[PDB]
PDB file of C-alpha atoms and ligand atoms in Angstrom:
ATOM      1  CA  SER U   1       0.000   0.000   0.000  1.00  0.00           C
ATOM      2  CA  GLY U   2       1.016   3.679  -0.594  1.00  0.00           C
ATOM      3  CA  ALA U   3       1.462   6.838   1.574  1.00  0.00           C
ATOM      4  CA  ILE U   4       2.200  10.637   1.318  1.00  0.00           C
ATOM      5  CA  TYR U   5       5.538  11.905   2.734  1.00  0.00           C
ATOM      6  CA  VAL U   6       5.283  15.723   3.331  1.00  0.00           C
ATOM      7  CA  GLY U   7       7.664  17.485   5.770  1.00  0.00           C
ATOM      8  CA  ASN U   8       8.026  15.230   8.845  1.00  0.00           C
ATOM      9  CA  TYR U   9       4.534  13.664   8.262  1.00  0.00           C
ATOM     10  CA  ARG U  10       3.460  10.287   6.841  1.00  0.00           C
ATOM     11  CA  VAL U  11      -0.196  10.202   5.603  1.00  0.00           C
ATOM     12  CA  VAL U  12      -1.812   6.751   5.281  1.00  0.00           C
ATOM     13  CA  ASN U  13      -5.188   5.115   5.069  1.00  0.00           C
ATOM     14  CA  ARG U  14      -6.234   4.851   8.785  1.00  0.00           C
ATOM     15  CA  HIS U  15      -7.338   1.167   8.580  1.00  0.00           C
ATOM     16  CA  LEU U  16      -3.808   0.246   7.154  1.00  0.00           C
ATOM     17  CA  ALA U  17      -1.811   2.295   9.806  1.00  0.00           C
ATOM     18  CA  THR U  18       0.902   0.225  11.581  1.00  0.00           C
ATOM     19  CA  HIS U  19       1.667  -0.005  15.295  1.00  0.00           C
ATOM     20  CA  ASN U  20       4.606   2.421  14.676  1.00  0.00           C
ATOM     21  CA  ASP U  21       2.123   4.888  13.077  1.00  0.00           C
ATOM     22  CA  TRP U  22      -0.166   4.737  16.145  1.00  0.00           C
ATOM     23  CA  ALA U  23       2.854   5.041  18.529  1.00  0.00           C
ATOM     24  CA  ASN U  24       3.973   8.219  16.664  1.00  0.00           C
ATOM     25  CA  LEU U  25       0.424   9.583  16.040  1.00  0.00           C
ATOM     26  CA  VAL U  26      -0.083  13.205  14.901  1.00  0.00           C
ATOM     27  CA  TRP U  27      -3.784  13.100  13.898  1.00  0.00           C
ATOM     28  CA  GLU U  28      -6.437  10.547  12.851  1.00  0.00           C
ATOM     29  CA  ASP U  29     -10.066  10.661  11.745  1.00  0.00           C
ATOM     30  CA  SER U  30     -12.062   7.416  11.202  1.00  0.00           C
ATOM     31  CA  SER U  31     -14.841   9.230   9.271  1.00  0.00           C
ATOM     32  CA  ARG U  32     -12.164  10.200   6.615  1.00  0.00           C
ATOM     33  CA  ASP U  33     -10.168   6.877   6.850  1.00  0.00           C
ATOM     34  CA  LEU U  34      -6.993   8.999   7.359  1.00  0.00           C
ATOM     35  CA  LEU U  35      -4.095   8.858   9.835  1.00  0.00           C
ATOM     36  CA  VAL U  36      -0.943  10.976  10.025  1.00  0.00           C
ATOM     37  CA  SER U  37       2.204   9.911  11.952  1.00  0.00           C
ATOM     38  CA  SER U  38       5.596  11.667  12.533  1.00  0.00           C
ATOM     39  CA  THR U  39       8.780  10.793  10.594  1.00  0.00           C
ATOM     40  CA  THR U  40      12.529  11.185  11.373  1.00  0.00           C
ATOM     41  CA  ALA U  41      13.376  12.016   7.667  1.00  0.00           C
ATOM     42  CA  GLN U  42      11.845  14.926   5.596  1.00  0.00           C
ATOM     43  CA  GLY U  43       9.559  13.813   2.701  1.00  0.00           C
ATOM     44  CA  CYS U  44       9.604  14.702  -1.056  1.00  0.00           C
ATOM     45  CA  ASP U  45       5.827  15.349  -1.591  1.00  0.00           C
ATOM     46  CA  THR U  46       4.035  18.726  -1.954  1.00  0.00           C
ATOM     47  CA  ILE U  47       0.316  18.925  -1.065  1.00  0.00           C
ATOM     48  CA  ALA U  48      -1.980  20.645  -3.570  1.00  0.00           C
ATOM     49  CA  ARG U  49      -3.869  23.751  -2.289  1.00  0.00           C
ATOM     50  CA  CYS U  50      -6.637  24.180  -4.880  1.00  0.00           C
ATOM     51  CA  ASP U  51     -10.127  23.073  -6.039  1.00  0.00           C
ATOM     52  CA  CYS U  52      -8.940  21.088  -9.133  1.00  0.00           C
ATOM     53  CA  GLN U  53     -11.321  18.332 -10.365  1.00  0.00           C
ATOM     54  CA  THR U  54      -8.814  16.868 -12.859  1.00  0.00           C
ATOM     55  CA  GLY U  55      -5.658  14.890 -12.091  1.00  0.00           C
ATOM     56  CA  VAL U  56      -3.797  11.583 -12.413  1.00  0.00           C
ATOM     57  CA  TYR U  57      -3.848   8.626  -9.993  1.00  0.00           C
ATOM     58  CA  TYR U  58      -1.696   5.537  -9.540  1.00  0.00           C
ATOM     59  CA  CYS U  59      -3.440   2.137  -9.789  1.00  0.00           C
ATOM     60  CA  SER U  60      -1.167  -0.622  -8.345  1.00  0.00           C
ATOM     61  CA  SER U  61      -3.543  -3.394  -9.617  1.00  0.00           C
ATOM     62  CA  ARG U  62      -2.779  -2.169 -13.222  1.00  0.00           C
ATOM     63  CA  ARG U  63       0.765  -0.887 -12.720  1.00  0.00           C
ATOM     64  CA  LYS U  64      -0.558   2.310 -14.440  1.00  0.00           C
ATOM     65  CA  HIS U  65      -1.254   6.007 -13.845  1.00  0.00           C
ATOM     66  CA  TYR U  66      -4.674   7.136 -15.210  1.00  0.00           C
ATOM     67  CA  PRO U  67      -5.937  10.662 -15.956  1.00  0.00           C
ATOM     68  CA  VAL U  68      -9.324  11.268 -14.244  1.00  0.00           C
ATOM     69  CA  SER U  69     -11.992  13.833 -13.526  1.00  0.00           C
ATOM     70  CA  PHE U  70     -13.175  13.654  -9.876  1.00  0.00           C
ATOM     71  CA  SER U  71     -15.932  15.104  -7.672  1.00  0.00           C
ATOM     72  CA  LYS U  72     -15.241  17.700  -4.881  1.00  0.00           C
ATOM     73  CA  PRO U  73     -14.755  16.181  -1.408  1.00  0.00           C
ATOM     74  CA  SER U  74     -18.178  14.999  -0.019  1.00  0.00           C
ATOM     75  CA  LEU U  75     -19.925  12.807   2.572  1.00  0.00           C
ATOM     76  CA  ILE U  76     -20.552   9.606   0.545  1.00  0.00           C
ATOM     77  CA  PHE U  77     -21.891   5.985   1.203  1.00  0.00           C
ATOM     78  CA  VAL U  78     -19.347   3.098   0.550  1.00  0.00           C
ATOM     79  CA  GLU U  79     -20.689  -0.458  -0.151  1.00  0.00           C
ATOM     80  CA  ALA U  80     -19.314  -3.652   1.505  1.00  0.00           C
ATOM     81  CA  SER U  81     -16.392  -5.541  -0.166  1.00  0.00           C
ATOM     82  CA  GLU U  82     -15.379  -9.256  -0.138  1.00  0.00           C
ATOM     83  CA  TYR U  83     -13.329  -8.277   3.016  1.00  0.00           C
ATOM     84  CA  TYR U  84     -14.880  -5.110   4.718  1.00  0.00           C
ATOM     85  CA  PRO U  85     -18.287  -3.567   5.676  1.00  0.00           C
ATOM     86  CA  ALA U  86     -20.382  -0.574   4.335  1.00  0.00           C
ATOM     87  CA  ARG U  87     -20.355   3.000   5.975  1.00  0.00           C
ATOM     88  CA  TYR U  88     -20.484   6.880   5.313  1.00  0.00           C
ATOM     89  CA  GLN U  89     -17.001   8.296   4.619  1.00  0.00           C
ATOM     90  CA  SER U  90     -16.369  12.111   4.688  1.00  0.00           C
ATOM     91  CA  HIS U  91     -13.977  14.239   2.533  1.00  0.00           C
ATOM     92  CA  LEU U  92     -14.257  11.581  -0.236  1.00  0.00           C
ATOM     93  CA  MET U  93     -13.845  12.303  -4.025  1.00  0.00           C
ATOM     94  CA  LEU U  94     -15.109   9.873  -6.686  1.00  0.00           C
ATOM     95  CA  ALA U  95     -13.847   9.228 -10.235  1.00  0.00           C
ATOM     96  CA  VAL U  96     -14.663   6.650 -12.932  1.00  0.00           C
ATOM     97  CA  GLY U  97     -11.826   4.152 -12.848  1.00  0.00           C
ATOM     98  CA  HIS U  98     -10.379   0.860 -11.672  1.00  0.00           C
ATOM     99  CA  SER U  99      -9.439   0.153  -8.044  1.00  0.00           C
ATOM    100  CA  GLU U 100      -9.362  -2.977  -5.860  1.00  0.00           C
ATOM    101  CA  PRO U 101      -7.728  -3.989  -2.520  1.00  0.00           C
ATOM    102  CA  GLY U 102      -4.074  -3.764  -3.761  1.00  0.00           C
ATOM    103  CA  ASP U 103      -4.506  -0.068  -4.792  1.00  0.00           C
ATOM    104  CA  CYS U 104      -4.964   1.476  -1.293  1.00  0.00           C
ATOM    105  CA  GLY U 105      -2.801   4.595  -0.786  1.00  0.00           C
ATOM    106  CA  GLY U 106      -1.979   5.324  -4.462  1.00  0.00           C
ATOM    107  CA  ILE U 107      -1.491   9.058  -5.040  1.00  0.00           C
ATOM    108  CA  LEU U 108      -3.957  11.333  -6.899  1.00  0.00           C
ATOM    109  CA  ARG U 109      -2.086  14.433  -8.147  1.00  0.00           C
ATOM    110  CA  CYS U 110      -2.948  17.681  -9.986  1.00  0.00           C
ATOM    111  CA  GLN U 111      -0.829  20.533 -11.320  1.00  0.00           C
ATOM    112  CA  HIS U 112      -0.520  21.868  -7.688  1.00  0.00           C
ATOM    113  CA  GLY U 113       0.773  18.547  -6.116  1.00  0.00           C
ATOM    114  CA  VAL U 114      -0.788  15.683  -4.115  1.00  0.00           C
ATOM    115  CA  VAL U 115      -4.607  15.896  -3.860  1.00  0.00           C
ATOM    116  CA  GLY U 116      -5.246  12.670  -1.868  1.00  0.00           C
ATOM    117  CA  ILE U 117      -4.876   8.873  -1.746  1.00  0.00           C
ATOM    118  CA  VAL U 118      -6.883   5.908  -3.164  1.00  0.00           C
ATOM    119  CA  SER U 119      -9.366   4.751  -0.458  1.00  0.00           C
ATOM    120  CA  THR U 120     -12.287   2.836  -2.109  1.00  0.00           C
ATOM    121  CA  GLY U 121     -13.346   0.798  -5.153  1.00  0.00           C
ATOM    122  CA  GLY U 122     -16.596  -0.562  -6.548  1.00  0.00           C
ATOM    123  CA  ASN U 123     -18.677  -0.815  -9.725  1.00  0.00           C
ATOM    124  CA  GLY U 124     -16.129   1.168 -11.880  1.00  0.00           C
ATOM    125  CA  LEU U 125     -15.581   4.020  -9.324  1.00  0.00           C
ATOM    126  CA  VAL U 126     -12.329   4.897  -7.443  1.00  0.00           C
ATOM    127  CA  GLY U 127     -12.671   7.024  -4.273  1.00  0.00           C
ATOM    128  CA  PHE U 128      -9.900   9.250  -2.930  1.00  0.00           C
ATOM    129  CA  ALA U 129      -9.451  10.655   0.594  1.00  0.00           C
ATOM    130  CA  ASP U 130      -8.757  14.386   0.156  1.00  0.00           C
ATOM    131  CA  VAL U 131      -5.838  16.040   2.005  1.00  0.00           C
ATOM    132  CA  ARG U 132      -6.001  19.568   0.483  1.00  0.00           C
ATOM    133  CA  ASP U 133      -7.907  20.997   3.528  1.00  0.00           C
ATOM    134  CA  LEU U 134      -5.080  19.803   5.954  1.00  0.00           C
ATOM    135  CA  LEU U 135      -3.050  23.051   5.746  1.00  0.00           C
ATOM    136  CA  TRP U 136      -1.088  22.119   8.919  1.00  0.00           C
ATOM    137  CA  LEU U 137       0.700  19.421   6.827  1.00  0.00           C
ATOM    138  CA  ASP U 138       2.698  22.351   5.237  1.00  0.00           C
ATOM    139  CA  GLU U 139       4.397  23.471   8.555  1.00  0.00           C
ATOM    140  CA  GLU U 140       5.810  22.403  11.984  1.00  0.00           C
TER     141      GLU U 140
HETATM  142  C1  LIG Q   1      -7.959   0.744   0.403  1.00  0.00           C
HETATM  143  C2  LIG Q   1      -7.516   1.940   1.223  1.00  0.00           C
HETATM  144  C3  LIG Q   1      -8.368   1.081  -0.991  1.00  0.00           C
HETATM  145  O1  LIG Q   1      -7.964   2.104  -1.514  1.00  0.00           O
HETATM  146  C4  LIG Q   1      -9.291   0.171  -1.725  1.00  0.00           C
HETATM  147  C5  LIG Q   1      -9.573   0.443  -3.063  1.00  0.00           C
HETATM  148  C6  LIG Q   1     -10.445  -0.355  -3.779  1.00  0.00           C
HETATM  149  C7  LIG Q   1     -11.030  -1.444  -3.163  1.00  0.00           C
HETATM  150  C8  LIG Q   1     -10.761  -1.735  -1.820  1.00  0.00           C
HETATM  151  C9  LIG Q   1      -9.885  -0.927  -1.102  1.00  0.00           C
HETATM  152  N1  LIG Q   1     -11.410  -2.817  -1.225  1.00  0.00           N
HETATM  153  C10 LIG Q   1     -12.377  -3.541  -1.819  1.00  0.00           C
HETATM  154  O2  LIG Q   1     -12.934  -4.461  -1.228  1.00  0.00           O
HETATM  155  C11 LIG Q   1     -12.734  -3.116  -3.256  1.00  0.00           C
HETATM  156  O3  LIG Q   1     -11.839  -2.235  -3.944  1.00  0.00           O
HETATM  157 ZN1  LIG Q   2      -4.812  21.502  -8.229  1.00  0.00          ZN
END
């Protein structure tokens, strides 16, 4: 699975966070499926600060990056999988595209930087957890 490395922060899907993530916790929110932990090394990624609805995401289950149009971050209902239950998720963006369990954490990027990470899949839709509202990732 994938993550964002910005400053001394590591941004992951909450349900895939490790014990080391939880032991170095900065912030977490179940409703968004996001968790941020602290890092010793500085990261290479820049977070987008924008309202773009077009970008490119990485799909591990295809070994491919795909250009997509996506919705603005919203409170959305997510169906059950073969291996997890159904629930409302907040700050979620949807696009038409392929995702499945191996694709968690793939980056969605726009011309301004990282928009979010792959979070959901079903019925030809990929959902992304937005990070562009988390301005505190840019400092401290
Ligand atoms: C996990 C964070 C993730 O991004 C993901 C994408 C697509 C799908 C799943 C998880 N799980 C499923 O069951 C279906 O597709
Ligand atoms: Zn942008």
